[PDB]
Amino acid sequence: LQLLHQKVEEQAAKYKHRVPKKCCYDGARENKYETCEQRVARVTIGPHCIRAFNECCTIADKIRKESHHKGMLLGR
16 A cells, blocks of 8 residues: 555656646545546546546556555565
């Protein structure tokens, strides 16, 4: 879970404007019922929100899957 937050914050730092940064955080929140492309269809507050929501959703969902299939690197 900490790895997810780190990678999401890394992307969110690239959105210097308030609305896309918040849309990044929104897209990175868990939705175990839908894909990123299904979820971003509901974003209606403009193209910068669409882009950031989708990008951070994509990053977060990829890390969720990696955490499930491989998980934490141990022994460091």
